Swiss-Prot record, chain A:
Name of the protein in its database record: RNA-directed RNA polymerase nsp12
Species assigned in the record: Severe acute respiratory syndrome coronavirus 2
Activation/inhibition comment: Inhibited by Remdesivir antiviral drug (GS-5734) through non-obligate RNA chain termination.
Quaternary structure, from the entry: Interacts with nsp7 and nsp8 to form the replication-transcription complex (RTC): nsp12, nsp7, two subunits of nsp8, and up to two subunits of nsp13. Interacts with nsp9.
Function in brief: RNA-directed RNA polymerase that catalyzes the transcription of viral genomic and subgenomic RNAs. Acts in complex with nsp7 and nsp8 to transcribe both the minus and positive strands of genomic RNA. The kinase-like NiRAN domain of NSP12 attaches one or more nucleotides to the amino terminus of NSP9, forming a covalent RNA-protein intermediate that serves as transcription/replication primer.
Segment of the intact protein contained: 4396 to 4525 of 7096
Curated annotation (Swiss-Prot), chain C:
Species of origin: Severe acute respiratory syndrome coronavirus 2
Ranges where the ExoN/MTase coactivator domain occurs: 1-131
Cell compartment(s), UniProt: Host cytoplasm, Host perinuclear region; Host cytoplasm; Host endoplasmic reticulum
Binding site for Zn(2+) 7: 74, 77, 83, 90
Protein name: Non-structural protein 10
Subunit structure: Forms a dodecamer and interacts with nsp14 and nsp16; these interactions enhance nsp14 and nsp16 enzymatic activities.
Binding annotation for Zn(2+) 8: 117, 120, 128, 130
Gene that encodes it: rep
Length: 130, 174, 131, 113
């Protein structure tokens, strides 16, 4: 399994510890602000297109930082790419990292958002209004 | 006035060290000082650039007898039936590394055929061009949604030209 | 997108070298087929001091001649076409070409008709002590 | 994770010019949304260097509007004979929302340089 887990620890702070499962995704109860064409609102869905790694610390204590790796369409993989490649500057951008990895015989793409935070401004504002 | 003929196709805008650019336009404005180019030891030459190049704007019409002018005029194609066969192709542009080039994907004629093929193109290299295979996507037009299942299943050029010249060699051989 | 490149006025010219498979005798028939030259060779500049060896890393020129680039001097590579080179491309891509004053109108026919001599490293006849 | 808006913004041709009177009847390209209030208009598309006014018949055709235009946005489309200069005027004081959806439908339709 690890070569993956290895291979998404990229180059930095190899102290990871998948509080996920193995190489499968995760299931989180997170409160989005959503508005496609059909649904809408500010509500708490069950999201699951993400593998989630809790980065640990020297002395091997946990520590609030995360690597969130999402897996989606090739085409969309390109869009995200060319965009990120346009905009890798204004420091308010979490430093992404793209790659292609294999699961089985499948060359599934993967995007790796680096060092985030367990929550998001959503969970704050939401679970303070409601 | 500049050409889409041999117009560069990759997004990299850093001019070529003119010892790696076969034309007086593909030189960065670091060498052109009053229409002349001055050698620069301040930076060495580059060996890391793989850009596809456009293949448009031809307008082929030299004038010699040693080749017969391929394009036939109004009558010389009306007179000669038992040769009429269609020719049309569909194309697309690349995604990440480059864009701005037209390359074929499906080829149709008068014969009830529509050949599939993966796109490839002349990438520029510090030694010559290579004939490289690049990621492809159809144009964003929604009427090209029919063109979705054609990019991940096409064919290279060698087998394609064999099969095409052989469709020729059994349908037009008569 | 990318970067512009060719002149539309010599389009036809490169067209004859884009679709040709016997492109050498083809383009020499073109130079002699009712046309004016490929008006885009990179124009270098040097002190015109040094030996006559054109194939040089930094312009190595005479008082008479004049330097163009190294790469922009082979039509086999000027047209991105395939090469009959054994392995498998053209050499002059990367250096410079100081052609003597006479034959320096077009360096394509020069690079193809002449080729450097191993003795003096110059173009064979311009000049040489080759016997 | 939150998609914006699948579109339906139409495009017509009509009248615009530089002053209240300079607007010739056919030279501009309106992008608009027929909302609750007629063919409610959003932005202008043109090829001319400048057009500071436009004129369009009303809902029923009573009068001709005298809707001024923005300092146009510069860009180049492609036509089979190379690049072609084009400007995108906006009806001044049009907030980010419709500017955005117009850019959406537009850049969707026209691929630029
Ligand atoms: Zn060559
Ligand atoms: Zn010699």
């Amino acid at each position: 399994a690890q070569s993956f887990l290895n291979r998404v620890c990229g180059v930095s702070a190899a102290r990871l510890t998948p509080c996920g499962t193995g190489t499968s995704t995760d299931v989180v109860y997170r409160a989005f602000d959503i508005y496609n064409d059909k649904v809408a609102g500010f509500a708490k869905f069950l999201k699951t297109n993400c593998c989630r790694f809790q980065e640990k610390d020297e002395d091997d204590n946990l520590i609030d930082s995360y690597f969130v790796v999402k897996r989606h369409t090739f085409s969309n993989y390109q869009h995200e790419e060319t965009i990120y490649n346009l905009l890798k500057d204004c420091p308010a951008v979490a430093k992404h990292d793209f790659f292609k990895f294999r699961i089985d015989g499948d060359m599934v793409p993967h995007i790796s958002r680096q060092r985030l935070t367990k929550y998001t401004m959503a969970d704050l504002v939401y679970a303070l209004r409601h | 006035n500049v050409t889409g003929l041999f117009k560069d196709c990759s997004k990299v805008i850093t001019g070529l060290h003119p010892t790696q650019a076969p034309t007086h336009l593909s030189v960065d404005t670091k060498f052109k000082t009053e229409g002349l180019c001055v050698d620069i030891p301040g930076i060495p030459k580059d060996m890391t650039y793989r850009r596809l190049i456009s293949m448009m704007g031809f307008k082929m019409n030299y004038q010699v007898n040693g080749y017969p002018n391929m394009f036939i005029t109004r009558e010389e194609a009306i007179r000669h039936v038992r040769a009429w066969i269609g020719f049309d192709v569909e194309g697309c542009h690349a995604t990440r590394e480059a864009v701005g080039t037209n390359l074929p994907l499906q080829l149709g004629f008068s014969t009830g055929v529509n050949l599939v093929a993966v796109p490839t193109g002349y990438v520029d290299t510090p030694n010559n061009t290579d004939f490289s295979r690049v990621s492809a996507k159809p144009p964003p037009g929604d009427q090209f949604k029919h063109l979705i299942p054609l990019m991940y299943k096409g064919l290279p050029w060698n087998v394609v030209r064999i099969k095409i010249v052989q469709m020729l060699s059994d349908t037009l051989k008569n | 997108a990318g970067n512009a490149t060719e002149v539309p006025a010599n389009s036809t010219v490169l067209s004859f070298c884009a679709f040709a498979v016997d492109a050498a005798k083809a383009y020499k028939d073109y130079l002699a087929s009712g046309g004016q030259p490929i008006t885009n060779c990179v124009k270098m500049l040097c002190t015109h001091t040094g030996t006559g060896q054109a194939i040089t890393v930094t312009p190595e020129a005479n008082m008479d001649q004049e330097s163009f680039g190294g790469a922009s001097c082979c039509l086999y590579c000027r047209c991105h076409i395939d090469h009959p080179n054994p392995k498998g491309f053209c050499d002059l891509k990367g250096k410079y070409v100081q052609i003597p004053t006479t034959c320096a109108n077009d360096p394509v026919g020069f690079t193809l008709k002449n080729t450097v001599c191993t003795v003096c490293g110059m173009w064979k006849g311009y000049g040489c002590s080759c016997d | 994770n939150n998609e914006l808006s699948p579109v339906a913004l139409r495009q017509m041709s009509c009248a615009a010019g530089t002053t209240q009177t300079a607007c010739t009847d056919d030279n501009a390209l309106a992008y608009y949304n027929t909302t609750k209030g007629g063919r409610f208009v959003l932005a202008l598309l043109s090829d001319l260097q400048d057009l500071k006014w436009a004129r369009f018949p009303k809902s029923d055709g009573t009068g001709t509007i005298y809707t001024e235009l923005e300092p146009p946005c510069r860009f180049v489309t492609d036509t089979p004979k190379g690049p072609k200069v084009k400007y995108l005027y906006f009806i001044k004081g049009l907030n980010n929302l419709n500017r955005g959806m117009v850019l959406g439908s537009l850049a969707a339709t026209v691929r630029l340089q």
